[PDB]
């Protein structure tokens, strides 16, 4: 069982989400298996932002046991801009552990290097999730997001727990179901860094959602490209903390990485500048 | 200098919110003067709920100094379920004291009964209010709602402390410089209630935003409605309790009704059941 240890309070630059298997902390990025079915596909997806929040919540590459932390831009704890319809974030958004978005080659479908991240997941459930849950999700298909120049996958999936998991099977099933949902989600990553003075981003495939087993092909591919990086065999890790407490056969393995991480301190959320109420008519 | 006095947890169903005038609790309804600046047309806005929430919060016609109180359905609080695009409330709500939609008379503009309440205001300024703030506004339009047949304007308006205040005078500098708002504005009224059962909702003036001439017009004939019902001088006054503590040429003024509210009882939020996170697309 994956449960979750909070250090500090929330939006402040000292809080750390760690994710424990087993009442143990374990990495984030390394010792969560990527699938939880493989033949059925299902995967297990970590949770990093609540739909409808503003807080850039990340998994840390530089820390061991790959926490989960605020993102900062300039010494500043960093925060989403609320864009015209749109309140923060408008899916469940997280990452498939034991994925890599490749920086060291250019992908041949955006012709672009990776971002240096683990694939994104947009969860389209009706739960709202929180930050560090490990959940089971089926994908349904995939966006080719281009941001800021990069090769940004943005996986679309759903909680096999949604009462309309059932019900979804591949792409076209999310326009009959989420109406308007596909269009509002390439609007939201065209447009959500305009109000940080950042170019408008841009869509491979003109914006079309590839399906199912396009998105499976692509999550498989950067699932390799993590076994290279793990096994120590990337021309280029990018300072990335390898470390592991659960791939006893890898460089990095250490069993004593997990009794190093201090205790859970939560406190009660700090607050948020009134700033980020605004909305911006973009 | 209006404060609040808050009785209990917000989210449960002992949730008051009084107002206070220098310390003492006035009603919300009556007490508290239509016009902040009459010759500048600048109005007091009685705030029920904030932009981005669901919890029904209204101005309470039948309870003594008009508290705002959570409307119930079922025994049940009542909560506004988030139809896509939307999050909740896309607007800061609220009212206008000192006004009634009289619903013993037909309306000549919509042929329709009043709803009895206040005339509602949405404030588009980019702070989210809190409720029980009385906040200063100016007028720029007014749309024509018919809300399950009756007579329920919507007064479009902005805080005077806003940034963009100045700039903006009248209804066209609405969509000057928060295109579409309008015409989200007119959606959300027209469906936020479908998923309830309700049938949609209707505009007359084909759902056009008519000006801030027009919109002065209809608040004055509302004010002259409320000082016909407070003066004792309505057919009908539908059970609502007229105890002011600041009009004395009133028959119902009473100045010991503040004394008699209880003392302030401030505890933290209750949770909200995560059936309320669930995206409506209708
Ligand atoms: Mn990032
Ligand atoms: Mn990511
Ligand atoms: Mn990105
Ligand atoms: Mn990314
Ligand atoms: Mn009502
Ligand atoms: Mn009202
Ligand atoms: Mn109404
Ligand atoms: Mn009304």
Known sequence: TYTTRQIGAKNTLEYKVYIEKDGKPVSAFHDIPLYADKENNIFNMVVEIPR???????????????????????????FVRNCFPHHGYIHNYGAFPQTWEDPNVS???????????????????????????????????????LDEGETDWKVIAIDINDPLAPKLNDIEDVE????????????????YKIPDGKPENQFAFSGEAKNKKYALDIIKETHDSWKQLIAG????????????????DTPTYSKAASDA??????????????????????
């Not at 065999?233 to 006893?248: A, E, H, M, R, Y």
């Open 52 to 78: 409808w929040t503003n807080a850039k919540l990340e998994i840390t590459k530089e820390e061991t046991l790959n926490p989960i932390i605020q993102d900062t831009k300039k010494g500043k704890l960093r």
């Open 107 to 145: 992908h041949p479908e955006t012709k672009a290097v990776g971002d240096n991240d683990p694939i994104d997941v947009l969860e389209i459930g009706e739960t709202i999730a929180y930050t560090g849950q490990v959940k089971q999700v089926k994908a349904l298909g995939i966006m080719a997001l």
């Open 176 to 191: 009959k179901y989420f109406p308007g949902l596909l269009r509002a989600t390439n609007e939201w990553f065209r447009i």
């Open 233 to 248: 065999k990337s021309s280029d890790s990018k300072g990335i903390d390898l470390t592991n407490v659960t791939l006893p």
């Open 261 to 282: 991480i201090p205790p859970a301190s939560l406190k009660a959320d700090a607050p948020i500048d009134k700033s980020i109420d605004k909305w911006f008519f973009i």
